[PDB]
Amino acid sequence: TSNEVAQFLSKENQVIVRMRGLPFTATAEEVVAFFGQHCPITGGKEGILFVTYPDGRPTGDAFVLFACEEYAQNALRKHKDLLGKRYIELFRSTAAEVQQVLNRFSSAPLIPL
């Protein structure tokens, strides 16, 4: 959702973490649970951007917002922890990379506003 992407990238002073390898059935609630209260996501479920194909099919990828560097460190320590049956690879990212990744899956490129 263009409004969803825009809302996600509008949050200032965030650290972005990329999730790779998610169960295709992964939900925002499960991602919140994966990080737990020691890595609170900015906006809760609203700080989670699932990367999807144009028809909404999942990719296995997501981005999440952390407001504090301590949260990002805690989060990165969960690299290869399980969500469901699958180990989750975690990487730091940036707004520019979020844009490039989203562009990989959309018919038209993102235009930031």
Numbering used by the authors: 312 to 424
The authors write:
The full-length ESRP1 is predicted to contain an RNase H-like domain and three quasi-RNA-recognition motifs (qRRMs) similar to those in hnRNP F. ESRP1 has been shown to control alternative splicing of multiple genes during EMT, many of which contribute to alterations in the actin cytoskeleton and cell motility. We found that the formation of this circRNA is dependent on the splicing regulator ESRP1, which promotes circDOCK1(2–27) formation by inhibiting splicing of exon 1 to exon 2, thereby holding the intron 1 acceptor site unspliced and available while Pol II completes its 157 kb journey from exon 2 to exon 27. We found by HITS-CLIP analysis that ESRP1 binds to a GU-rich motif in a tandem repeat region in intron 1.
Crystals that diffracted to 1.65A with space group P3121 were obtained for the ESRP1 qRRM2 domain complexed to a 12-mer RNA with sequence UGGUGGUGGUGG. The qRRM2 comprises four β-stands flanked by two alpha-helices at each side of the β-sheet. These helixes cover the beta-sheet region, making the qRRM domain different from canonical RRM domains, in which the RNA-binding region is located at the beta-sheet region, whereas the qRRM2 of ESRP1 binds to the RNA substrate through loop regions. The structure shows contacts with just three nucleotides of the RNA, with the sequence GGU binding within a double clamp arrangement. The three nucleotides are accommodated into a positively charged region, with two loop regions important for nucleotide binding, one of which is between β1 and α2 (Loop12 in Figure 5D) and another one between α3 and β4 (Loop34). The three nucleotide bases face down to Loop12 and Loop34, and the phosphate groups of the RNA are distal from the protein backbone, enhancing the sequence-specific RNA recognition by qRRM2. A close view of the interactions reveals that the two guanine residues are inserted into two clamps separated by Arg397 and form a π–π stacking like a sandwich. For G1 recognition, besides the stacking interactions from Arg397 and Phe335, the base of G1 is also specifically recognized through a number of hydrogen bonds. G2 is clamped by the side chain of Arg397 and Tyr398. Mutating each of the three important residues Phe335, Arg397 and Tyr398 to alanine resulted in the loss of RNA binding ability, and the R331A and E400A mutants showed dramatically decreased RNA binding affinity, consistent with the observations in the complex structure.
